[PDB]
Scaffold this active site. Structure first.
Site, PDB file in Angstrom:
ATOM      1  N   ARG A 117      38.094 -47.704 -68.562  1.00 34.40           N
ATOM      2  CA  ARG A 117      38.100 -47.009 -69.850  1.00 34.40           C
ATOM      3  C   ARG A 117      36.710 -47.053 -70.474  1.00 34.40           C
ATOM      4  NH1 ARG A 117      41.098 -48.731 -75.607  1.00 34.40           N
ATOM      5  NH2 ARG A 117      40.904 -46.621 -76.488  1.00 34.40           N
ATOM      6  N   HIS A 118      36.392 -46.034 -71.264  1.00 34.84           N
ATOM      7  CA  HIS A 118      35.175 -45.990 -72.073  1.00 34.84           C
ATOM      8  C   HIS A 118      35.045 -47.202 -73.023  1.00 34.84           C
ATOM      9  CE1 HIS A 118      37.549 -45.169 -75.633  1.00 34.84           C
ATOM     10  NE2 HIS A 118      38.269 -44.361 -74.878  1.00 34.84           N
TER      11      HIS A 118
ATOM     12  N   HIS B  26      39.644 -42.749 -69.525  1.00 30.35           N
ATOM     13  CA  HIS B  26      40.461 -43.131 -70.644  1.00 30.35           C
ATOM     14  C   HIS B  26      41.415 -44.259 -70.292  1.00 30.35           C
ATOM     15  CE1 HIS B  26      39.156 -39.395 -72.629  1.00 30.35           C
ATOM     16  NE2 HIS B  26      39.127 -38.947 -71.388  1.00 30.35           N
TER      17      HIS B  26
END
Lengths: 266, 264
Positions: B7-8, B193
């Site tokens: 995930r970011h 994500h």
């Protein structure tokens, strides 16, 4: 003249919980890194790893908070002429990493002042944390002044101390710090605890301290690296809180994640 | 062969709340820095600052999370041969800063793949975010491949997409990613994500997806830079989730502080 007072960086024990020692130390009491928020190494302590229980270190992100504050001070050309800290390892490590961000780690030498330790009611049991002496702190590559003679040595602190005693010694030590820095550079940085920001500056400004219940509630609002500035107005000689020369620092969490407990495997 | 999916980093809009634009932009829509967790600059966007509303940047700490992960991968002696990301700015910035940690920012070129964007039901309204095209991302000094031809271009995404469509396109795109990296380097990194860790690996492993509710509840548990690894066992050719080659990253908050309100 300006007094800057700020809180230490993120604590290892708060992030990693009641049994955080088990995440940081092996069966023989040697330090191990089990999370990216932990450093490559921690100082050896005289009483072994359990000395860390009442005197936890900062995290990697605690270090980064401290460095971001130092860099912001540098960027704003806020010249720090003297730096003091609480004997708590978390405070010393925070101060060292502010110096790094400030790029003053080879010039400024941190004066460890037990006078700046928080209200001793916050210490469990009847003995003080086994603070690492300045000689050992320096050996651990923290930029501490091993020649600094404290105003309130460890010998003068008591674990039985009343709220009034805590506020009074904070007032006392803050005046002595200012007094000895007078004409030796305008800006003084104290790196200590949540409670320090009000305790070091309240009576300095001529104000009456709050009752201890309201004090404790307020102290829970001071984030890591919470930073205040208390300036002496030239015209009157009165000390007063003012806007710090740097922006505030605010960020959120990165929660704990076990991929086995969460992602589909069957 | 390993597929790494993460995930970011920390999102600017999550930290600073509903009216976060008011904390980052002035009356003319120019970026202003009002917190040390905000960067020194943000890219100029074609539709002005409101384009950030549906496509927020990462914070300074988000960047530091990214670089730490990159550094850990470097320390673990884990070589990343290819990197892909969602077109979400937060994913691109995170991927760039992972490359920084890896010291690969001048060799690896990030492949921006709209197929890796999350379930489009998480987008408000009936239009997608105005993602910054790769040529503009490169112009903002992000290490993106401007020649990469995506497998699912923006033109192929539907804002009204069903859960099953999101899961299926995630499977489709992940296979196509794996196929084009075959025999050209063993490890692939996807930076996307919360939902991508599972969506990209579920059917790859031959598993049946969860229903949308259990999926959402699980998705809420994935922290910033949350990292998983899906390995191809050489004996069978079956993909399975395995322990990542790096430690997890966990930290707490540093909440807001108004010294006027709190101190005497």
């Amino acid at each position: 003249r300006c007094l800057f007072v700020c809180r230490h960086g993120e604590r290892m024990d708060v992030v990693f919980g009641k049994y955080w020692l088990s995440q940081c130390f092996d069966a023989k009491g040697r330090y191990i890194r089990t999370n990216l928020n932990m450093p490559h190494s921690l100082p050896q302590r005289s009483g072994g790893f359990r000395d860390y229980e009442k005197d936890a270190p900062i995290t990697v992100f605690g270090c980064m908070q401290a460095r971001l504050v130092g860099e912001a001070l540098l960027e704003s050309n806020t010249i720090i002429d003297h730096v003091y800290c609480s004997p708590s390892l978390r405070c010393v490590q925070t101060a060292h990493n502010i110096l790094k961000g400030l790029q003053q780690e080879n010039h400024l030498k941190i004066r460890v002042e037990p006078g700046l330790f928080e209200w001793t009611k916050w210490v469990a049991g009847s003995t003080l944390p086994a603070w690492i002496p300045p000689s050992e702190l320096a050996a651990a590559n923290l930029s501490v002044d091993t020649t600094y003679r404290p105003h309130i040595p460890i010998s003068k602190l008591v674990v039985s101390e009343s709220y009034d005693t805590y506020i009074s010694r904070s007032f006392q030590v803050t005046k002595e710090i200012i007094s000895e820095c007078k004409s030796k550079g305008n800006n003084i940085l104290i790196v200590a605890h949540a409670s320090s920001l009000e305790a070091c500056t309240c009576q300095l400004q001529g104000l009456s301290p709050q009752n201890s219940k309201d004090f404790v509630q307020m102290v829970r609002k001071i984030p890591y690296l919470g930073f205040c500035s208390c300036e002496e107005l030239g015209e009157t000689g009165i000390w007063q809180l003012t806007d710090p020369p740097i922006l505030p620092l605010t960020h959120g969490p990165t929660g704990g994640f076990n991929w086995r407990e969460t992602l589909l495997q069957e």
